[PDB]
Design a protein around this nucleic acid. Structure first.
Lengths: 215, 225, 215, 225
RNA sequence: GGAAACUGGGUAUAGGUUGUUCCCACCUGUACCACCCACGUGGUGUAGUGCUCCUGUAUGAAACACGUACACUUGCACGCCAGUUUCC
RNA sequence: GGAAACUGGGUAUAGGUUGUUCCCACCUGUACCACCCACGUGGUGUAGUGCUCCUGUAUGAAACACGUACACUUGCACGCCAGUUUCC
């Protein structure tokens, strides 16, 4: 039976100078063959801790790790701006090696309402026979938003997708794009295309919309 | 000084096979264990395989049993991963990692390659079509406007978007791509700009999809309807 | 001012396979600059742990150290007989360096009776005008024994001294010598010199004796 | 290969001075911190002083400041402890210890010398007399008999007892010295042997008391008639 | 006191018994009772030596394997002790 | 299209100017409220550059000192965005 490393929390929000601790539990004993890694988006992992509590050379002393039974904790005693990243534990006590699911560390900040933009399908794409409606939520916080499309007041299911940016390095906000895709034939059957945004920065849901052909 | 470079990545048909290679510099692989670790888009690290020094022993994640084969050619300082019977599930970035020296870093993986993307899909290489997200004739939101480019129906990843050949960066968001039911990716890139610049400034997005050598520049304007 | 390292217990006994833990609490923070050392009696200390939780090369993995705030524990997961020693913590976070008082660890084992020998004064020593009568208790356990000197059945007081070997790190037995000192004049006033030993390995006390001048 | 050897210890009058030396081999002292640590008989370790590499900075325990002076002769690979105004309290075994490499063992002291005993006392050196502890007059046990050497009335410590010039080691107990009310130490060394080995084995204890250059060999036998 | 040959944990007991006077030894059975294993229908003087076997620990650029060192445990041989018998 | 000069956190509110339209490009006082400091009776468009200043971090056989690399925080100048004003 493979050793499972259960890592918690899966994400946490903190501000610079804070002390974070990430825990990681071995399903069965691993003694001390635990490593921790820091990964930033688009980059390879970097080793931080080995043998559960030993600071890898070149790594700042604000990182440390400790072991208590089958519990392993990574601690950052005082968060620096370069420490927002994802962190993984790893057992190497026996093969197969096992990684934790990861913990994402994010910048806390004041709530910021999304700004909603709606964008109708372009003339060029309608030539292709397909119609895409894009809704933008810009520079908001926290990350949680819910966007549902209504087309002539019918809530849409299963024909739009979202995508969210990484947290902005300067102002710590997220942005989110939602795209609703219809065949141009099916598009021409309705008139009012709306994006309804609920976010905790919004004291009541925002609706942005347009009418097909009337701009 | 010390580094590892994976290559051999790319697009593979389902049920296909691929041999990744991991070329070492700054040290000799015969004295280290070498590991392959992969990462599906938006997911954690998954250990794949490893090879022992002095004994040649090999270990495999159960999820690649009978399909992957790790190996090492010490007269090239290069490690290899032979992948067979590839399925879409094996789409990930693949890293090779060196287990560091026991006395100095235990069993930690102390150096990692930048990793090579492997894409398992029966879809065919295709450059994107790019469409403008025109700033609203009336009112996208208000204040300062937003505009963008929809980079739709391309394959495989990745795609490069820049604005005005890199000279406008502030307020730009290029979103993570989303894989559609058609098997083609689609992403959008957006920019927010002064509302007063709209009458005096043209905004053109530069899309580059290297797997098909497609460069598309798209000028985005307010619509005139 | 000076950082104080407080170590507990100051002594302990346990048997092979037991898990021993020695704690050591630093008054004010030392971060992680703690080392543990094993000193066997009569020998230089040997380093065991550094940076509070890193295993020094060559040291068995049944040794480990952990840190929690200003508390440091050395753990031996499975006691071997050769782990009889005194163990010291040490802070090296700021000068002056500080050691804890040490924890002396000895091995529990099955009761073992002493074998008693008695030794009369040599002719050479009696030349000088002094008599030393030696009682030997060999290879016993536990450490507590009671040795009474009788000179013609007069229980002797205040003219003998004891010495006990370090616990045998191999079989964990002790040996003990008792030395009775009389002037040659006082020695020659009596005939029967006896050593009486009570120890719990003995179902009743053993006496060894001799007669002065009787060969 | 790496080792440290202290010398210069011995017996000193109160208010006297003494220079300890610590001669290194297998490594160069200028790339390490060097520490002096002492241990009063029957007590713990007490840190005394240290000297830093590349700068010569020195640090002193509170109780020896202004009287002890640590220094290092990097051209002889030796460290020194100048002890002046010696007080009664300064009786201890004195170790020099190397602080290990930062990257390899933190601040731990990874090699230690065997130590040199320093004895502060206005008392006078005296060699032991060695007396036979003769095997059993009545042949006590038909199994193994005991014999030994009584090493009496010496000062200061220490004294070494060996058997048959080291050729007999099994079953030897050399007891800790005991301070008699006279101010002289006394110990015995004992050994068990087959009762039949008497008359067929010569047993000689070799007593060496270096503080007075006394070497005594004593052959031990059952008494006669 | 020499030289050889034989035997090897107690304890208790039925005993037996240098074939001779109870029985020292010898010699077992039995019940026991311990110590030690790799735990059986098991083994049984032992801090010596060689080899063997069982593992553990540490280390060699070293998770397994392989080396080295150190410990651990089987057994055998030789030594040593304890008897015993025998002759000088 | 040149050339120049000047200005710079919101938010309220009292003024000044601006055409006159009641608000403007603005700008000053004040309150409130932020971000930032090295924390004041202080500072305020800015993911760029240089110098500087404040610390921190990593590392050099390295607890201090010394070297190097990297970050940080002042302040300044240039560049950049946003405006005005002016002149050809």
């Amino acid at each position: 039976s493979d050793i499972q490393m259960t890592q918690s929390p899966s994400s946490l929000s903190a501000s610079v100078g804070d002390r974070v601790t990430i825990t990681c539990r071995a399903s069965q004993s691993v003694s001390s063959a635990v490593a921790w890694y820091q990964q930033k988006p688009g980059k390879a992992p970097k080793l931080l801790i080995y043998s559960a509590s030993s600071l890898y050379s070149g790594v700042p002393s604000r990182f440390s790790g400790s072991r208590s039974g089958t519990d392993f904790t990574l601690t950052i005693s005082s968060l620096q701006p370069e420490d927002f990243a994802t962190y993984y534990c790893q057992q190497s006590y026996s093969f197969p090696s096992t990684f934790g699911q990861g913990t994402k560390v994010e910048i806390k900040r004041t709530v910021a309402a999304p700004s909603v933009f709606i964008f109708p399908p372009s003339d060029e794409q309608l030539k292709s026979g397909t119609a895409s409606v894009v809704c933008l939520l810009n520079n908001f916080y926290p990350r949680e938003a819910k966007v549902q499309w209504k087309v002539d007041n019918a809530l849409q299911s299963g024909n739009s997708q979202e995508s969210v940016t990484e947290q902005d390095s300067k102002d710590s906000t997220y942005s989110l794009s939602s795209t609703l895709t219809l065949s141009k034939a099916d598009y021409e059957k309705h008139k009012v295309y709306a994006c309804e945004v609920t976010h905790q920065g919004l004291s009541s849901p925002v609706t942005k919309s347009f009418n097909r052909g009337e701009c | 000084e010390v580094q590892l470079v994976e290559s051999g990545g790319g697009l593979v048909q389902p049920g296909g096979s691929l041999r990744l290679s991991c070329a070492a510099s700054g040290f000799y692989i015969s004295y280290s264990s070498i590991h392959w670790v992969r990462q599906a888009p938006g997911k954690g690290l998954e250990w794949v395989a490893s090879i022992s020094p002095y004994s040649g022993s090999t270990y495999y994640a159960d999820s690649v049993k009978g399909r992957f084969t790790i190996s090492a050619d010490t007269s090239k300082n290069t490690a290899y991963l032979q992948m067979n019977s590839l399925r879409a599930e094996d789409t990930a970035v693949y890293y090779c990692a060196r287990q560091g020296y026991r006395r100095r870093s235990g069993r930690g993986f102390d150096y990692w390659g930048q990793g090579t993307l492997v894409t398992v899909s029966s879809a065919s290489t295709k450059g994107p079509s790019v469409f403008p997200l025109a700033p609203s004739s009336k009112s996208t939101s208000g204040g300062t406007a937003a505009l963008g480019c929809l980079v739709k129906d391309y394959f495989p990843e990745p795609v490069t978007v820049s604005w005005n050949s890199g000279a406008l960066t502030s307020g730009v968001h290029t979103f993570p791509a989303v894989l559609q039911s058609s098997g083609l990716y689609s992403l959008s890139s957006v920019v927010t700009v002064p509302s007063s610049s709209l009458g005096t400034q043209t905004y053109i997005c530069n899309v580059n999809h290297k797997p098909s050598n497609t460069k598309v520049d798209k000028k985005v304007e307010p619509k005139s309807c």
